[PDB]
């Protein structure tokens, strides 16, 4: 909003009138100041923070009703069916059909837990997720890890 | 985790260390006071912390509170308005 | 039949028919502007009665010491009773929605190629 | 099929009724099976607008504001054009759109259009400040 | 073969092509119009693929990295598994070794077992006791569902009121904390992963109890079995020459404190793995049994019903202590028990073959069988992955053509008319809905707040009729037909009906037929 | 079973005081159609249509055609069991 | 940090090329002339496909990628390198090229079925 503001003008308008004056919409004579040019430059700026979303600076939008009116006419159904607040609460509708309900409704995050590859136990692994290792010597990371002559031995 | 690695490694702690303990509790209360205001819990909790360093580390490994030490202490209690507190640590000082 | 696995212009009958598939579901979503409509109930109840009746429609089925290979070709059919891995290993080779997932997946067809003369549906093709 | 959720929703299978209404409103011939016709929906809305006074007027365009504006954004001229079409419902303009190949392409952006929610909740957000913290 | 890593081109060939034929098929099923010549077609595209999967069966496991990964998988898996029943038959041994020294027929089973082992490979006793499991849990599981479904009539409904994943990770860590009281994450994750394979059903049995508001832990046999079932199953130099395997040593200690999170991640992933694993298998019971077992045996049911209403009288007297019963469950019992000798297609007679395997001799034919069968199950697999992706497809596609109908028609009712009695009866409502209305805090909290455009509609403080009125019109339909007979008689025309310059927009009076001529 | 007097009383007095015809305050609970509130034979038969909309009962021509002023319709529903 | 881990990877691919096996060096061979002759690589392609995936996918769908690839080391890249490869147009002729290769007579056709369309 205060993008949209700055550049061309107020975009609530008549959001501060009184007895109907102190109106800031466009003018009604069709022309470079009315309402085609004016709504083509607040698409142009919608269009420029839809790249953002685009290119991942932004969040991604919600689905709204406007873009739920088109859903290829049939994944409005799908939406409807699950809770489908978010594209990607969507996506993962339709990329995980194990994890519904019965009905179509979608279940939440908090029961859904991945499966943890056993290649994370590695000792390389274990030295990047841990924060003490670099302060932690190489001897006290070797006495932690082996206690043996593989690893007895400067360093 | 670094001061019990260093008390483990057995080296002698030095007045530098303990007072860079000292700055990070302290600069964490003054911190947690201005981003996060409530949970007063935690205030007190990075408060407590500090002010243990400050009254019992510097006996316990037998150093002396330096200007430093009183700088970060002094930023503490100025950012909580100890006017009174931090004036006597000055004029102490 | 065999011969109709490979590639070079061998089961044109089928061929054809999946190919252009791809191209009127690609001109449909495109420009089909009677097409972008809100469900008014109508799609509503008829949806769920083409879904029950696509449940009810039936697959037909068709007629359906040990050297170490054996054992554990046995291991596995003993001790194993439902993986639930293998299933989605199947994924990457029957590229589930293959065909609508280039149309309901999110972003992936960009503005500037959205004409009915771009060939944007062959992308995917990967030859021998 | 459910029948749970509208076992549930009872205090508000209302507004269920009164959307699925709303969707299936068209414009024909009264005396056809359609309700009523543009020229009927552009007089109500005339003499509704008429019928206003400066308070009325004021309302009126802080809903245009609050709804119209975002999605009036959002939308191109295009898009706005084909709308047009299908208020009138006259099956020969409708048929000549189709013909055009520029209306039709241009027209499915829906991932563009969910920002028209985003810039809705700003306005509302901005109107809510005034009319609630006010 | 054509599954193996350098094919791949020729098998999505494979799965448009299947794809085109099973899409014919659904629609000439679905129309009625099933053709014999679409399921010979069929017939002959699945016996090719299955030639590919059988060729591709051994191919695959050579060279496919999870294939390889699996197999590790399960043989380590069948080692901890037959290392636990050998605790178990070491402690056995024990016991029967005090009863007698000599046991010579024992000893001659044990040998033969183990003889098995070498040639076979698989544990007996193993094998004996994860078939006991699966059969006591599928005969709870039959037990659970028809009692339910006769008890309430309903079936299996998982909805978000269920036992959440977080509560059935808490119930097993407390499960485990109670039965050794010093079982850590590590410990508990160590156990479930060693055993992944003991069908728990904790879960459904929970479901259950919940739905039927009754204890279910002790009075049901097949509840017992399954219980005493599982109560049953539960130097220097040298060291120096032992190699160290530096692939061991590239992994750090499991007993390392960095491992928590990685643990209590697991443990998570295990109890998802579980509960899913329980859901699925109720729900196929639900959809085999449960479609049948409420419409049919009408008088089985109403007398299961009845049943459930005296129990639910007893369920309430003993409330009302609480703030006869087993004689009545030992009816239904019985009752379902009707439904059991009606219950047909058990899936036990596996083991019923691998004991024909067991004492088979002509060991090459039995094992090209058995090859037979996994190349034909794992090629049901692959049509039944194919049969859904072509299901939803064509969901998908048909609900994108259905938009273009029309919409259904409303049935007409009385016209709208707000009641005289209506309207004089909350007036009160009225007042109070101007009064809140007044104050700026509380103007938007008002009930019944429709809106047009802009304006919100009030509550009408008078009746709204419709026979008194519309009498200004027709007086003035008569004065403009006085005016429209001078018009006639004198040769005049309205305004230019088509679009003209002195009225752009064609503003033309809708012609009626009445009114015509 | 039977409604008190008091309430259609009060119901066909506003009714017929929202008719466009009639002029309110000319209304009391003993009026005329015709001779006191003014309006034609013509009126009298959307009138009583008016307290039948009010009253979905369906009145028989006869007995519309006794009732030609407020008081006889008044007494005519309040002596009605069907009425609602 | 990217020179260091492609460093590595030519540390599997140079112990590769060091083998002695006949197909561990063949494959060598083939990545070696590859990477002369600068045809980019397939697995940096995947990693800017899976790192657009899950930029747009759902929480779900994030923590078991997340999770799937947090120990497959992959590079660590900007969202604007994945962007940048997504953003430039696909040839039209490696697209007619390999549908006609793929289906022949089949791709032809569809290939004057567009060009008529055009």
Same mark, same amino acid.
């Given at each position: 909003?205060?993008?949209?503001?700055?550049?061309?003008?107020?975009?609530?308008?008549?959001?501060?009138?009184?007895?109907?004056?102190?109106?800031?919409?466009?003018?009604?004579?069709?022309?470079?100041?009315?309402?085609?040019?004016?709504?083509?430059?607040?698409?142009?700026?919608?269009?420029?923070?839809?790249?953002?979303?685009?290119?991942?600076?932004?969040?991604?939008?919600?689905?709204?009703?406007?873009?739920?009116?088109?859903?290829?006419?049939?994944?409005?159904?799908?939406?409807?069916?699950?809770?489908?607040?978010?594209?990607?609460?969507?996506?993962?509708?339709?990329?995980?059909?194990?994890?519904?309900?019965?009905?179509?409704?979608?279940?939440?995050?908090?029961?859904?837990?991945?499966?943890?590859?056993?290649?994370?136990?590695?000792?390389?692994?274990?030295?990047?997720?841990?924060?003490?290792?670099?302060?932690?010597?190489?001897?006290?990371?070797?006495?932690?890890?082996?206690?043996?002559?593989?690893?007895?031995?400067?360093? | 985790?670094?001061?019990?690695?260093?008390?483990?490694?057995?080296?002698?702690?030095?007045?530098?260390?303990?007072?860079?303990?000292?700055?990070?509790?302290?600069?964490?209360?003054?911190?947690?006071?201005?981003?996060?205001?409530?949970?007063?819990?935690?205030?007190?909790?990075?408060?407590?912390?500090?002010?243990?360093?400050?009254?019992?580390?510097?006996?316990?490994?037998?150093?002396?509170?330096?200007?430093?030490?009183?700088?970060?202490?002094?930023?503490?209690?100025?950012?909580?308005?100890?006017?009174?507190?931090?004036?006597?640590?000055?004029?102490?000082? | 039949?065999?011969?109709?696995?490979?590639?070079?212009? @061998?089961?044109? @009958?089928?061929?054809?028919?999946?190919?252009?598939?791809?191209?009127?579901?690609?001109? @449909?979503?495109?420009?089909?502007?009677?097409?972008?409509?809100?469900?008014?109930?109508?799609?509503?109840?008829?949806?769920?009665?083409?879904?029950?009746?696509?449940?009810?429609?039936?697959?037909?089925?068709?007629?359906?010491?040990?050297?170490?290979?054996?054992?554990?070709?046995?291991?596995?059919?003993?001790?194993?009773?439902?993986?639930?891995?293998?299933?989605?290993?199947?994924?990457?080779?029957?590229?589930?929605?293959?065909?609508?997932?280039?149309?309901?997946?999110?972003?992936?067809?960009? @503005?500037?190629?959205?004409?009915?003369?771009?060939?944007?549906?062959?992308?995917?093709?990967?030859?021998? | 099929?459910?029948?749970?959720?509208?076992?549930?929703?009872?205090?508000?299978?209302?507004?269920?009724?009164?959307?699925?209404?709303?969707?299936?409103?068209?414009?024909?011939?009264?005396?056809?099976?359609?309700?009523?016709?543009?020229?009927?929906?552009?007089?109500?809305?005339?003499?509704?607008?008429?019928?206003?006074?400066?308070?009325?007027?004021?309302?009126?365009?802080?809903?245009?504001?609050?709804?119209?504006?975002?999605?009036?954004?959002?939308?191109?001229?295009?898009?706005?054009?084909?709308?047009?079409?299908?208020?009138?419902?006259?099956?020969?303009?409708?048929?000549?759109?189709?013909?055009?190949?520029?209306?039709?392409?241009?027209?499915?952006?829906?991932?563009?259009?969910?920002?028209?929610?985003?810039?809705?909740?700003?306005?509302?957000?901005?109107?809510?400040?005034?009319?609630?913290?006010? | 073969?054509?599954?193996?890593?350098?094919?791949?081109?020729?098998?999505?060939?494979?799965?448009?092509?299947?794809?085109?034929?099973?899409?014919?098929?659904?629609?000439?099923?679905?129309? &009625?119009?099933?053709?014999?010549?679409?399921?010979?077609?069929?017939?002959?595209?699945?016996?090719?693929?299955?030639?590919?999967?059988?060729?591709?069966?051994?191919?695959?496991? /050579?060279?496919?990295?999870?294939?390889?990964?699996?197999?590790?998988?399960?043989?380590?898996?069948?080692?901890?598994?037959?290392?636990?029943?050998?605790?178990?038959?070491?402690?056995?041994?024990?016991?029967?070794?005090?009863?007698?020294?000599?046991?010579?027929?024992?000893?001659?089973?044990?040998?033969?077992?183990? !003889?098995?082992?070498?040639?076979?490979?698989?544990?007996?006793?193993?094998?004996?006791?994860?078939?006991?499991?699966?059969?006591?849990?599928?005969?709870?599981?039959?037990?659970?569902?028809?009692?339910?479904?006769?008890?309430?009539?309903?079936?299996?409904?998982?909805?978000?009121?269920?036992?959440?994943?977080?509560?059935?990770?808490?119930?097993?860590?407390?499960?485990?904390?109670?039965?050794?009281?010093?079982?850590?994450?590590?410990?508990?994750?160590?156990?479930?992963?060693?055993?992944? &394979?003991?069908?728990?059903?904790? =879960?459904?049995?929970?479901?259950?109890?919940?739905?039927?508001?009754?204890?279910?832990?002790?009075?049901?046999?097949?509840?017992?079995?399954?219980?005493?079932?599982?109560?049953?199953?539960? !130097?220097?130099?040298?060291?120096?020459?032992? !190699?160290?395997?530096?692939?061991?040593?590239?992994?750090?200690?499991? /007993?390392?404190?960095?491992?928590?999170?990685?643990?209590?991640?697991?443990?998570?992933?295990?109890?998802?793995?579980?509960?899913?694993?329980?859901?699925?298998?109720?729900?196929?019971?639900?959809?085999?049994?449960?479609?049948?077992?409420?419409?049919?045996?009408?008088?089985?049911?109403?007398?299961?019903?009845?049943?459930?209403?005296?129990?639910?009288?007893?369920?309430?007297?003993?409330?009302?202590?609480?703030?006869?019963?087993?004689?009545?469950?030992?009816?239904?019992?019985?009752?379902?028990?009707?439904?059991?000798?009606?219950?047909?297609?058990?899936?036990?007679?596996?083991?019923?073959?691998?004991?024909?395997?067991?004492?088979?001799?002509?060991?090459?034919?039995?094992?090209?069988?058995?090859?037979?069968?996994?190349?034909?199950?794992?090629? %049901?697999?692959?049509?039944?992955?194919?049969?859904?992706?072509?299901?939803?497809? %064509?969901?998908?596609?048909?609900? %994108?053509?259905?938009?273009?109908?029309?919409?259904?028609?409303?049935?007409?009712?009385?016209?709208?008319?707000?009641?005289?009695?209506?309207?004089?009866?909350?007036?009160?409502?009225?007042?109070?809905?101007?009064?809140?209305?007044?104050?700026?805090?509380?103007?938007?909290?008002?009930?019944?707040?429709?809106?047009?455009? &802009?304006?919100?509609?009030?509550?009408?403080?008078?009746?709204?009729?419709? =026979?008194?009125?519309?009498?200004?019109?027709?007086?003035?339909?008569?004065?403009?037909?006085?005016?429209?007979?001078?018009?006639?008689?004198?040769?005049?025309?309205?305004?230019?009906?088509?679009?003209?310059?002195?009225?752009? =927009?064609? =503003?033309?009076?809708?012609?009626?037929?009445?009114?015509?001529? | 079973?039977?409604?008190?007097?008091?309430?259609?009383?009060?119901?066909?007095?506003?009714?017929?005081?929202?008719?466009?015809?009639?002029?309110?305050?000319?209304?009391?609970?003993?009026?005329?159609?015709?001779?006191?509130?003014?309006?034609?034979?013509?009126?009298?038969?959307?009138?009583?249509?008016?307290?039948?909309?009010?009253?979905?009962?369906?009145?028989?021509?006869?007995?519309?055609?006794?009732?030609?002023?407020?008081?006889?319709?008044?007494?005519?529903?309040?002596?009605?069991?069907?009425?609602? | 940090?990217?020179?260091?881990?492609?460093?590595?990877?030519?540390?599997?691919?140079?112990?590769?090329?060091?083998?002695?096996?006949?197909?561990?060096?063949?494959?060598?061979?083939?990545?070696?002339?590859?990477?002369?002759?600068?045809? #980019?690589?397939?697995?940096?392609?995947?990693?800017?496909?899976?790192?657009?995936?899950?930029?747009?996918?759902? #929480?779900?769908?994030?923590?078991?990628?997340?999770?799937?690839?947090?120990?497959?080391?992959? #590079?660590?890249?900007?969202?604007?390198?994945?962007?940048?490869?997504?953003?430039?147009?696909?040839?039209?002729?490696?697209?007619?090229?390999?549908?006609?290769?793929?289906?022949?007579?089949?791709?032809?056709?569809?290939?004057?079925?567009?060009?008529?369309?055009?």
């Amino acid at each position: 909003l205060p993008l949209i503001r700055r550049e061309e003008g107020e975009i609530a308008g008549s959001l501060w009138a009184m007895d109907g004056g102190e109106l800031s919409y466009p003018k009604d004579g069709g022309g470079p100041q009315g309402w085609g040019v004016r709504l083509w430059r607040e698409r142009q700026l919608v269009k420029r923070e839809y790249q953002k979303v685009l290119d991942g600076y932004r969040p991604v939008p919600q689905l709204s009703t406007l873009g739920n009116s088109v859903r290829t006419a049939g994944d409005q159904l799908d939406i409807e069916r699950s809770g489908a607040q978010t594209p990607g609460e969507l996506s993962d509708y339709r990329n995980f059909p194990d994890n519904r309900f019965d009905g179509g409704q979608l279940k939440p995050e908090s029961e859904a837990a991945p499966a943890v590859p056993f290649s994370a136990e590695l000792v390389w692994q274990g030295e990047a997720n841990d924060k003490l290792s670099p302060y932690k010597s190489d001897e006290e990371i070797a006495l932690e890890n082996d206690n043996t002559f593989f690893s007895s031995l400067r360093r | 985790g670094i001061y019990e690695l260093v008390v483990r490694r057995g080296w002698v702690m030095q007045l530098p260390f303990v007072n860079a303990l000292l700055r990070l509790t302290c600069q964490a209360t003054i911190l947690s006071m201005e981003r996060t205001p409530d949970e007063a819990e935690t205030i007190g909790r990075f408060e407590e912390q500090a002010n243990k360093i400050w009254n019992h580390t510097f006996d316990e490994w037998q150093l002396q509170k330096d200007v430093y030490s009183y700088e970060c202490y002094i930023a503490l209690l100025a950012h909580q308005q100890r006017i009174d507190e931090a004036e006597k640590l000055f004029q102490e000082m | 039949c065999f011969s109709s696995w490979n590639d070079g212009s @061998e089961g044109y @009958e089928w061929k054809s028919r999946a190919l252009s598939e791809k191209r009127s579901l690609a001109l @449909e979503f495109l420009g089909n502007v009677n097409k972008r409509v809100s469900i008014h109930d109508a799609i509503r109840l008829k949806a769920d009665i083409n879904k029950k009746a696509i449940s009810n429609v039936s697959c037909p089925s068709f007629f359906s010491h040990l050297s170490p290979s054996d054992a554990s070709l046995l291991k596995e059919e003993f001790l194993c009773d439902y993986d639930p891995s293998d299933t989605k290993r199947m994924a990457k080779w029957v590229n589930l929605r293959s065909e609508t997932s280039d149309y309901q997946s999110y972003g992936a067809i960009p @503005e500037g190629e959205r004409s009915l003369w771009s060939a944007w549906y062959l992308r995917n093709i990967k030859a021998g | 099929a459910s029948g749970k959720d509208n076992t549930m929703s009872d205090d508000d299978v209302i507004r269920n009724i009164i959307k699925e209404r709303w969707k299936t409103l068209e414009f024909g011939d009264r005396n056809a099976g359609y309700p009523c016709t543009f020229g009927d929906y552009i007089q109500f809305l005339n003499e509704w607008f008429k019928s206003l006074d400066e308070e009325g007027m004021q309302r009126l365009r802080e809903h245009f504001d609050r709804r119209i504006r975002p999605l009036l954004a959002v939308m191109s001229p295009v898009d706005i054009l084909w709308l047009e079409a299908l208020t009138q419902n006259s099956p020969h303009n409708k048929e000549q759109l189709q013909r055009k190949i520029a209306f039709q392409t241009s027209l499915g952006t829906p991932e563009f259009f969910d920002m028209s929610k985003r810039l809705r909740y700003e306005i509302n957000e901005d109107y809510k400040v005034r009319d609630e913290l006010g | 073969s054509l599954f193996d890593p350098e094919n791949v081109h020729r098998l999505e060939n494979a799965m448009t092509h299947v794809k085109q034929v099973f899409a014919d098929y659904v629609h000439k099923k679905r129309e &009625g119009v099933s053709t014999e010549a679409e399921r010979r077609m069929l017939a002959n595209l699945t016996a090719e693929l299955n030639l590919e999967t059988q060729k591709h069966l051994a191919n695959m496991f /050579k060279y496919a990295e999870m294939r390889l990964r699996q197999v590790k998988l399960e043989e380590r898996h069948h080692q901890l598994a037959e290392i636990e029943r050998l605790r178990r038959m070491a402690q056995q041994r024990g016991g029967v070794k005090g009863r007698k020294g000599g046991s010579r027929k024992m000893s001659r089973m044990e040998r033969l077992k183990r !003889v098995i082992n070498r040639a076979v490979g698989l544990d007996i006793a193993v094998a004996e006791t994860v078939l006991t499991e699966m059969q006591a849990q599928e005969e709870f599981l039959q037990f659970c569902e028809v009692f339910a479904r006769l008890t309430l009539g309903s079936g299996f409904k998982h909805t978000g009121k269920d036992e959440n994943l977080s509560a059935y990770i808490e119930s097993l860590r407390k499960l485990y904390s109670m039965d050794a009281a010093t079982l850590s994450t590590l410990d508990v994750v160590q156990y479930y992963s060693s055993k992944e &394979g003991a069908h728990p059903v904790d =879960w459904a049995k929970r479901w259950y109890e919940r739905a039927l508001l009754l204890p279910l832990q002790s009075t049901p046999e097949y509840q017992k079995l399954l219980q005493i079932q599982q109560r049953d199953e539960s !130097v220097a130099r040298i060291k120096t020459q032992k !190699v160290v395997n530096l692939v061991e040593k590239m992994f750090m200690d499991p /007993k390392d404190k960095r491992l928590e999170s990685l643990h209590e991640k697991r443990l998570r992933y295990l109890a998802h793995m579980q509960m899913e694993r329980q859901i699925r298998c109720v729900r196929e019971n639900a959809k085999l049994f449960d479609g049948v077992e409420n419409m049919p045996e009408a008088a089985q049911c109403r007398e299961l019903y009845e049943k459930i209403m005296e129990k639910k009288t007893a369920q309430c007297n003993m409330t009302s202590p609480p703030e006869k019963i087993r004689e009545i469950t030992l009816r239904v019992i019985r009752d379902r028990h009707v439904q059991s000798a009606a219950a047909t297609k058990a899936r036990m007679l596996n083991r019923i073959i691998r004991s024909l395997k067991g004492g088979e001799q002509s060991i090459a034919e039995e094992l090209r069988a058995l090859h037979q069968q996994r190349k034909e199950k794992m090629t %049901m697999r692959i049509l039944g992955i194919i049969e859904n992706d072509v299901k939803t497809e %064509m969901e998908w596609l048909q609900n %994108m053509e259905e938009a273009e109908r029309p919409p259904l028609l409303p049935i007409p009712e009385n016209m709208s008319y707000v009641s005289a009695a209506d309207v004089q009866a909350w007036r009160e409502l009225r007042e109070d809905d101007e009064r809140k209305a007044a104050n700026p805090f509380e103007r938007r909290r008002r009930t019944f707040q429709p809106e047009l455009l &802009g304006q919100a509609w009030s509550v009408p403080n008078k009746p709204l009729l419709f =026979w008194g009125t519309g009498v200004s019109a027709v007086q003035q339909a008569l004065r403009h037909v006085a005016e429209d007979a001078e018009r006639k008689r004198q040769g005049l025309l309205l305004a230019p009906p088509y679009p003209c310059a002195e009225n752009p =927009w064609g =503003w033309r009076l809708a012609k009626d037929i009445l009114d015509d001529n | 079973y039977l409604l008190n007097k008091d309430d259609v009383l009060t119901r066909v007095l506003e009714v017929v005081k929202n008719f466009e015809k009639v002029d309110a305050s000319k209304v009391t609970p003993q009026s005329h159609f015709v001779n006191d509130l003014g309006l034609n034979s013509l009126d009298v038969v959307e009138v009583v249509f008016a307290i039948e909309q009010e009253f979905i009962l369906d009145i028989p021509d006869h007995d519309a055609e006794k009732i030609q002023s407020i008081t006889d319709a008044v007494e005519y529903i309040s002596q009605n069991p069907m009425a609602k | 940090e990217r020179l260091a881990w492609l460093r590595d990877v030519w540390a599997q691919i140079d112990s590769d090329y060091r083998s002695g096996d006949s197909a561990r060096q063949e494959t060598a061979a083939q990545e070696i002339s590859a990477a002369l002759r600068g045809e #980019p690589n397939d697995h940096m392609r995947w990693v800017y496909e899976t790192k657009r995936e899950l930029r747009f996918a759902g #929480p779900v769908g994030r923590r078991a990628i997340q999770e799937e690839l947090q120990a497959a080391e992959l #590079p660590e890249v900007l969202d604007e390198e994945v962007n940048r490869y997504h953003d430039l147009k696909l040839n039209m002729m490696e697209i007619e090229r390999e549908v006609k290769a793929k289906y022949g007579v089949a791709g032809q056709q569809h290939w004057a079925e567009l060009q008529a369309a055009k």
